[PDB]
Amino acid sequence: HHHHHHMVHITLDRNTANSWLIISKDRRQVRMGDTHQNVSDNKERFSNYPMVLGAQRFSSGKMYWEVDVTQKEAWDLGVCRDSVQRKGQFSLSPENGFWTIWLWQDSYEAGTSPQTTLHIQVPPCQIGIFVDYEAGVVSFYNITDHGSLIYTFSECVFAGPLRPFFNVGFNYSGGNAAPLKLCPL
Template identity: 55%
Template sequence: MASGNNLMEKLQDEVSCSICLEYLKDPVTIDCGHNFCCMCISDYCERWSTAGAALCPQCRAGFLQSTFRPNRQLANIVEGFEQLALQTDKEPMEKLCEKHGKKLHLFCEDDGEAICLVCDKSREHRSHTVIPIEEAAQDYKVGLRQFLGPAWFLPLQEKVRARRELIVAEFAKRHQALEEEKQLLLQRLEEDEEETLRKLQENTAFLVEQSSSLVQLMSEIEQKCQQPAADLWGLLWLDVTLDPSTANAYLLLSQDQQRVRVSEKRQDVPNNPERFDTCTCVLGRQRFTAGRHYWEVDVGEKTSWTLGVCEESVSRQGIFTPSPATGFWTIWLRNGDEYAALTSPLTELMLRVKPRQIGVFLDYEAGEVSFYNVTGSSHIYTFHDTFSESLRPYFYPGVRAGGLNDAPLSLQPGTE
């Protein structure tokens, strides 16, 4: 029977809360593994926790209040144990007095032990202070709670205090660093603002100066615009003449060297290296290494031609394909209505008005060669490039095409 009592006492300890000393109610488990009534450990933490942390009432291990875990399995065990205890009440399981075999209803405060009613009347305890065992149990509960008071939490509180001071110091250090960085950024921002304002003022002064120049330029342009277009081009107009020494043997040049057309027969001309030996084309006498120049060519009703400028050093022998890569900046007409700029690949040109006269404008320094439809008073195409050697006017009157393209290319003289 004694071993049965010991087992029941051991089980009773396991299912009892070490704070209230009653059976566990709504048991929860903390980080260290010990179990307590949910209400008991919550009240305990409310009184003694610091920054959400406390020490276990049993082992003094630290835990966080936020990590409580309900222990449903233990709750079922406690419930089963309570039912078992009720059943065994019919067979007393309490501890009995070892001397008299009676129930222990009293507690001797002098000896600190439970006694029975017979012991209370004995000489051993007659002069001692004896109280009911329930009252003694309550006193011990109060004493235990007091024992689990501030003394247990001093180390934790000291640790938390030191941690708090460390955090405060660290944040103060970071705050100081951020404040210094803020001041540095504000200083840089102020410097950037001053620099931007200075540049803005300089640009404003420059724009004011440029505005004055533009007003003057606009006035000059307005005056120029009142002049006829021919007068404006006349300022740049160049009387271009053809260079016979470069003309292919099947070309016929006029006596004034301002018209060229294709002949059926080969002409008796010297076989000099400047002459185009295969392609029926010819160059102008003029060579350009600077400046702006303009000339016009009458193409009439021709069905094919090529006009523009080329480098002095272009090949004169064999067949070649004109393009900027080979030193040619030209446009052409083919099959009577197919216009193109000789880029690589070709750039097709859509002209609303069929030109009878083509204007060619060269701006050497700007690297531009522009073509104009004089008949329709419109721009046709502009090449943009960089020139590094002498340029010369280039003319290709096309093939005869059974007489359909016999008309000559005619250079227009400048107007005085």
């Protein structure tokens, strides 16, 4: 793809993080802690899942960023409305304000309702995410496989400002402790 010149510097917003997440000093990495990280609760924190938002809000233009997912067994990535539900149980869908893909149990799926099977021959170590606000597009790219297309959400109805969205996943298996990392430009 040729989206690299729309690169944006994303940082993670601590205040939105599930209380078990550990965000690095530079706000560019996040991992699941083995316990509560000793922060106060607030109405913004994701309560049920190991999720966090980027600080940046997008309401126009074209944006591109990359995320490192090396050795993880489970994660969700994409964008979401600024006003998505934070508390309780919910599914990742455009109806609920999410445009995402994930890895779960050795399969990759797009967060449509119902979910869509993805066809990935080369397991990605880094994912590229492209948003075209005006066109209503969110696309995902396999950086490990020379930028090949993973999935395009088109005819998106964003209906609000967008934020970068991350889920590091649970670590019940002991094989999913590795971080998500925002890759340098």
